Coordinates of all heavy atoms in Angstrom, one line a residue:
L151 N -6.2 -7.6 -30.9 CA -5.8 -8.5 -29.8 C -4.8 -7.8 -29.0 O -4.6 -8.1 -27.8 CB -5.2 -9.8 -30.4 CG -6.2 -10.7 -31.1 CD1 -5.5 -11.9 -31.8 CD2 -7.3 -11.2 -30.1
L170 N -10.5 -15.8 -33.8 CA -9.9 -17.1 -33.7 C -9.1 -17.5 -35.0 O -8.3 -18.4 -35.0 CB -10.8 -18.2 -33.4 CG -11.1 -18.4 -31.9 CD1 -12.2 -19.4 -31.7 CD2 -9.9 -18.8 -31.1
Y172 N -6.9 -15.6 -36.1 CA -5.5 -15.3 -35.8 C -4.8 -16.5 -35.1 O -3.6 -16.8 -35.3 CB -5.5 -14.1 -34.8 CG -4.1 -13.7 -34.4 CD1 -3.4 -12.6 -35.1 CD2 -3.4 -14.3 -33.3 CE1 -2.2 -12.2 -34.7 CE2 -2.2 -13.9 -33.0 CZ -1.5 -12.9 -33.6 OH -0.3 -12.5 -33.3
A173 N -5.6 -17.3 -34.3 CA -5.0 -18.4 -33.6 C -4.6 -19.5 -34.6 O -3.5 -20.1 -34.5 CB -6.0 -19.0 -32.6
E174 N -5.4 -19.7 -35.7 CA -5.0 -20.6 -36.7 C -3.8 -20.2 -37.5 O -3.0 -21.0 -37.9 CB -6.2 -20.8 -37.7 CG -7.5 -21.4 -37.1 CD -8.7 -21.3 -38.1 OE1 -8.6 -20.4 -38.9 OE2 -9.6 -22.1 -38.0
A175 N -3.6 -18.8 -37.7 CA -2.6 -18.3 -38.5 C -1.2 -18.5 -37.8 O -0.2 -18.8 -38.5 CB -2.8 -16.8 -38.7
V176 N -1.1 -18.4 -36.5 CA 0.1 -18.4 -35.8 C 0.4 -19.8 -35.1 O 1.5 -20.0 -34.6 CB 0.2 -17.3 -34.7 CG1 0.0 -16.0 -35.4 CG2 -0.8 -17.6 -33.6
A177 N -0.6 -20.7 -35.1 CA -0.4 -22.0 -34.5 C 0.7 -22.8 -35.2 O 0.6 -22.9 -36.4 CB -1.7 -22.8 -34.5
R178 N 1.6 -23.4 -34.4 CA 2.7 -24.2 -35.0 C 2.2 -25.6 -35.1 O 2.5 -26.5 -34.2 CB 4.0 -24.0 -34.1 CG 4.3 -22.6 -33.8 CD 5.2 -22.5 -32.6 NE 4.5 -22.4 -31.3 CZ 4.9 -22.6 -30.1 NH1 6.2 -23.0 -30.0 NH2 4.2 -22.5 -29.1
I179 N 1.5 -25.9 -36.1 CA 0.9 -27.3 -36.3 C 1.2 -27.7 -37.8 O 1.5 -26.9 -38.6 CB -0.6 -27.3 -36.0 CG1 -1.3 -26.4 -36.9 CG2 -0.8 -27.0 -34.6 CD1 -2.8 -26.5 -36.8
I226 N -13.1 -24.7 -31.3 CA -12.3 -24.0 -30.3 C -13.2 -23.2 -29.4 O -13.1 -23.3 -28.1 CB -11.2 -23.2 -30.9 CG1 -10.2 -24.0 -31.6 CG2 -10.6 -22.2 -29.9 CD1 -9.2 -23.3 -32.5
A252 N -8.0 -11.7 -26.2 CA -6.7 -12.2 -26.1 C -6.7 -13.6 -25.4 O -5.9 -14.4 -25.6 CB -5.8 -11.2 -25.3
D253 N -7.7 -13.8 -24.5 CA -7.7 -15.0 -23.7 C -8.2 -16.2 -24.6 O -7.7 -17.3 -24.6 CB -8.7 -14.9 -22.5 CG -8.5 -16.1 -21.6 OD1 -7.4 -16.3 -21.1 OD2 -9.6 -16.7 -21.3
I254 N -9.3 -15.9 -25.4 CA -9.8 -17.0 -26.3 C -8.8 -17.3 -27.4 O -8.8 -18.5 -27.9 CB -11.2 -16.7 -26.8 CG1 -11.9 -17.9 -27.4 CG2 -11.1 -15.5 -27.8 CD1 -13.3 -17.6 -27.9
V255 N -8.0 -16.4 -27.9 CA -7.0 -16.6 -28.9 C -5.9 -17.4 -28.3 O -5.4 -18.4 -29.0 CB -6.6 -15.3 -29.6 CG1 -5.3 -15.6 -30.4 CG2 -7.7 -14.8 -30.4
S256 N -5.4 -17.1 -27.1 CA -4.4 -17.9 -26.5 C -4.9 -19.3 -26.2 O -4.1 -20.2 -26.3 CB -4.0 -17.2 -25.2 OG -3.0 -18.0 -24.5
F257 N -6.2 -19.4 -25.8 CA -6.7 -20.7 -25.7 C -6.8 -21.5 -27.0 O -6.5 -22.7 -27.1 CB -8.2 -20.6 -25.1 CG -8.9 -21.9 -25.0 CD1 -8.8 -22.6 -23.8 CD2 -9.7 -22.4 -26.0 CE1 -9.4 -23.8 -23.6 CE2 -10.4 -23.6 -25.8 CZ -10.2 -24.3 -24.6
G258 N -7.1 -20.7 -28.1 CA -7.1 -21.4 -29.4 C -5.8 -21.9 -29.9 O -5.7 -22.9 -30.5
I259 N -4.7 -21.1 -29.7 CA -3.4 -21.5 -30.0 C -3.0 -22.8 -29.3 O -2.5 -23.8 -29.9 CB -2.4 -20.4 -29.8 CG1 -2.7 -19.2 -30.6 CG2 -0.9 -20.9 -30.1 CD1 -2.0 -17.9 -30.2
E260 N -3.2 -22.8 -28.0 CA -2.9 -24.0 -27.2 C -3.8 -25.1 -27.6 O -3.4 -26.3 -27.5 CB -3.1 -23.7 -25.7 CG -2.9 -24.8 -24.7 CD -3.2 -24.5 -23.3 OE1 -2.6 -23.5 -22.8 OE2 -4.1 -25.1 -22.7
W261 N -5.1 -24.9 -28.0 CA -6.0 -25.9 -28.4 C -5.5 -26.6 -29.6 O -5.5 -27.9 -29.7 CB -7.4 -25.3 -28.6 CG -8.5 -26.3 -28.9 CD1 -9.4 -26.8 -27.9 CD2 -8.8 -26.9 -30.1 NE1 -10.2 -27.6 -28.5 CE2 -9.9 -27.8 -29.8 CE3 -8.3 -26.9 -31.4 CZ2 -10.5 -28.6 -30.8 CZ3 -8.9 -27.7 -32.4 CH2 -10.0 -28.5 -32.1
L262 N -5.0 -25.9 -30.6 CA -4.6 -26.4 -31.9 C -3.2 -27.2 -31.7 O -3.0 -28.3 -32.3 CB -4.5 -25.4 -33.0 CG -5.8 -24.8 -33.5 CD1 -5.6 -23.5 -34.2 CD2 -6.5 -25.8 -34.4
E263 N -2.3 -26.5 -31.0 CA -1.0 -27.1 -30.8 C -1.0 -28.4 -30.0 O -0.1 -29.2 -30.1 CB 0.0 -26.1 -30.3 CG 0.3 -24.9 -31.2 CD 1.3 -24.0 -30.7 OE1 1.6 -24.0 -29.4 OE2 1.8 -23.2 -31.4
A264 N -2.0 -28.6 -29.1 CA -2.1 -29.8 -28.3 C -2.6 -31.0 -29.1 O -2.4 -32.1 -28.7 CB -3.0 -29.5 -27.1
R265 N -3.3 -30.7 -30.2 CA -3.9 -31.8 -31.0 C -3.2 -32.1 -32.3 O -3.6 -33.1 -32.9 CB -5.4 -31.5 -31.3 CG -6.3 -31.5 -30.0 CD -7.6 -30.7 -30.3 NE -8.5 -30.8 -29.2 CZ -8.4 -30.2 -28.0 NH1 -7.4 -29.4 -27.8 NH2 -9.3 -30.4 -27.1
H266 N -2.2 -31.4 -32.6 CA -1.5 -31.6 -33.9 C 0.0 -31.3 -33.8 O 0.3 -30.3 -33.2 CB -2.1 -30.7 -35.0 CG -3.6 -30.8 -35.1 ND1 -4.3 -31.9 -35.7 CD2 -4.6 -30.0 -34.6 CE1 -5.6 -31.7 -35.6 NE2 -5.8 -30.6 -35.0

Side-chain angles (χ1 to χ4, degrees):
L151 295 170
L170 277 174
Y172 182 97
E174 296 170 335
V176 304
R178 311 159 270 163
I179 60 175
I226 292 168
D253 191 60
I254 193 176
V255 165
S256 178
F257 179 88
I259 299 165
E260 175 184 305
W261 190 97
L262 289 161
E263 293 183 345
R265 290 161 172 78
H266 308 283

